Design a binder for this molecule. Structure first.
Ligand SMILES: Cc1cc2nc3c(=O)[nH]c(=O)nc-3n(C[C@H](O)[C@H](O)[C@H](O)COP(=O)(O)OP(=O)(O)OC[C@H]3O[C@@H](n4cnc5c(N)ncnc54)[C@H](O)[C@@H]3O)c2cc1C
Ligand SMILES: Cc1cc2nc3c(=O)[nH]c(=O)nc-3n(C[C@H](O)[C@H](O)[C@H](O)COP(=O)(O)OP(=O)(O)OC[C@H]3O[C@@H](n4cnc5c(N)ncnc54)[C@H](O)[C@@H]3O)c2cc1C
Lengths: 343, 346
């Protein structure tokens, strides 16, 4: 089970890597920590994205869909819910990847596309809270439309919370914010927009229980307790959003034995073709640093394409330097046939 | 003055995204293109399906052009069409003057060269007054496959491109004729074998010698064929005529310029990984840019363009940030987004 190309990470860079790897006819695997492909766009799926080349403005949610679909065009082996723990370069020059459960994967080449690492939202510490993640307890704003005309309480006071409140005020029926401190630890320019308009803020307050109402499995009321007086208010709500920050895991390369050059203790020091200091090991997306790195989704595509063209030649030296342009690539002939049936 | 921040030469993918991103970073932006339509080399393949633009599900070149043009015009740059830029002059203060073929002049703090492989023009039919029918059914590209559904088309020429057109139209058209001036179908001897096992009928040592219009409409109804080795003069009823005799190419822009601009292999601008040329304030993006990490795709044009724009902004405003603000949080979209979000809420 030795793969041609194994992509670590399922964001824009990893997904396009898998795509272009399949366009160049390589046995391809993609390994992602979360149960869902898409990467960091999951942090802002409600926002409008204008700066992807060739795309008219689209929401994060819709962009994730289009990238996942393109990334799976050639049916790579998809390994979700898996944290890659370490990368080993074997003596024969192939690579072995160890997962958190000790399972192992083997590859001729590895494309590191871990972006800024593993992100996990800090969870609400109340007993049966995770029961409501399947209904109306959220850790992101999945879409603005989800909250049209609904009553929403945001727990937390970061810049993310102030941002969420400000975009939801025009849309929700009502917006509540509860912060456990006495001052909104946000930016003192967008904090006043929040305060001159519709949002109602509670300070030194937190959520202490989630009431599901008689017959349903979704939150209807929220118990609020004040930390300076002591009141135990109750509040009817349609939606709850927790913004208590994020937990980060960047240990992948520290846990590995590879003389891979690192910039600023995190980023892979690459060149303009996405090569690292280790043969057959490439870097694409936010994990990649070089003088020409473009810190946009559009840059991730360039990083990925360069990585794959190099991987192809590493594996097959007589391969051409570049992939066949898709309009004339025979690899799409069968698929194009079905689509052409559009008359 | 009429002094622009960024003037883009070339309206293809690289130029259009440059214009967009230049607007994203709040610079006075102008874009100059030779043809009457923006879009670049994609007008050579508008019927093909394009799969490898990042984030894009397969779409025809026709639709991609539409999408690229709308994005490139987001911030309403000054668009100068039907205009050939003849030379680039670096003025004594380090600004630039661009001279068009009619002598007009444009001025800019920075210049982004996005001319691809240059100005491309189809080789026209050497027949009197043929241009009359360009408005009707005399085509120099396959603008779409559906345009030829169940129709009768003759293709003149026999190169790899002519063989490719016939091959994609044979399953779609009622009937495909190919007429070639040579003895052999001088394409590539692989897909040439697909053409002659299929329903496409070839006429060798033949060329089109006159076009015959209909009487009650002014398309072409009959084509006069002349076999050049016998002498026969056939006539042939058709719905569509497609010419493919090659292209004319105009690459003189940089030869005609007095710029100390390093050139690779007599054509490409020798850039670095940030799309900089050897001349301060002159950038290159797209197929015209060569450096060790240049990606020869539409996807690569976008990175060349963003990198070029970020550099132009710092050249013009040294304290500007090295990076543009991501669109999702960039205040320059706020009023536009408000209108979009309103539509989204039913
Ligand atoms: C708020 C915000 C807004 C942005 N907006 C824009 C915008 O409008 N336009 C734009 O062009 N760019 C934008 N970006 C820039 C950024 O490039 C993209 O957001 C994108 O996420 C980068 O893609 P990437 O694949 O390289 O990294 P990521 O998207 O971070 O993908 C990395 C993936 O790898 C996984 N992973 C990491 N480590 C491991 C491991 N050890 N094992 C398994 N899986 C692992 C992670 O779970 C994640 O899914 C924005 C960034 C932010 C933070
Ligand atoms: C047949 C074919 C298929 C392709 N398929 C794909 C594909 O499927 N996917 C992919 O990613 N890439 C593909 N490409 C690759 C190529 O990058 C794109 O086609 C694209 O055209 C390059 O963008 P560009 O803006 O830099 O240059 P161009 O598209 O060539 O645009 C340059 C523009 O500048 C104008 N111009 C030039 N000189 C002047 C001047 N002096 N004054 C004024 N205007 C001027 C020209 O008129 C033209 O409009 C393909 C290329 C070809 C030939």
């Amino acid at each position: 089970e030795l793969f041609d190309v194994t992509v670590i990470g399922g964001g824009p860079a990893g997904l396009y890597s898998a795509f272009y790897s399949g366009l160049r006819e390589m046995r391809t695997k993609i390994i992602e920590f979360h149960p869902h492909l898409g990467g960091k766009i999951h942090v802002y799926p409600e926002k409008m994205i204008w700066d992807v080349g060739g795309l008219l403005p689209v929401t994060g949610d819709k962009l994730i869909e289009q990238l996942v679909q393109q990334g799976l065009t050639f049916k790579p082996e998809v390994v979700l819910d898996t944290k890659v723990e370490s990368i080993i370069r074997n003596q024969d020059g192939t690579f072995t990847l160890k997962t958190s459960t000790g399972e192992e994967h083997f590859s001729k080449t590895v494309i590191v596309a871990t972006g800024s690492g593993i992100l996990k939202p800090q969870k609400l510490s109340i007993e049966g809270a995770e029961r409501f993640e399947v209904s109306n307890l959220n850790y992101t704003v999945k879409s603005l439309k989800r909250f049209k005309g609904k009553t929403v309480i945001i727990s937390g006071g970061g810049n993310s919370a102030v941002d969420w409140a400000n975009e939801l005020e025009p849309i929700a029926k009502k917006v509540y914010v509860t912060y456990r401190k006495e001052e909104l630890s946000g930016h003192e320019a967008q904090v006043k927009q929040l305060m001159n308009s519709s949002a109602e803020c509670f300070f030194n307050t937190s959520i202490t229980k989630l009431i599901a109402g008689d017959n349903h499995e979704a939150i209807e009321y929220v118990e609020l307790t004040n930390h300076e007086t002591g009141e135990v208010s109750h509040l009817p709500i349609d939606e709850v959003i927790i913004n208590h920050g994020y937990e980060r895991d960047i240990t992948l390369l520290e846990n590995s034995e590879l003389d891979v050059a690192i910039i600023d203790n995190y980023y892979i020091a690459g060149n303009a073709n996405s090569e690292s200091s280790v043969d057959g090991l490439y870097a694409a997306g936010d994990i990649l640093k070089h003088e020409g790195k473009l810190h946009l989704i559009a840059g991730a595509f360039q990083d990925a394409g360069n990585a794959v063209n190099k991987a192809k030649q590493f594996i097959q030296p007589d391969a051409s330097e570049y992939g066949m342009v898709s309009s004339h690539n025979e690899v799409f002939k069968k698929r194009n046939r079905e689509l052409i049936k559009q008359m």
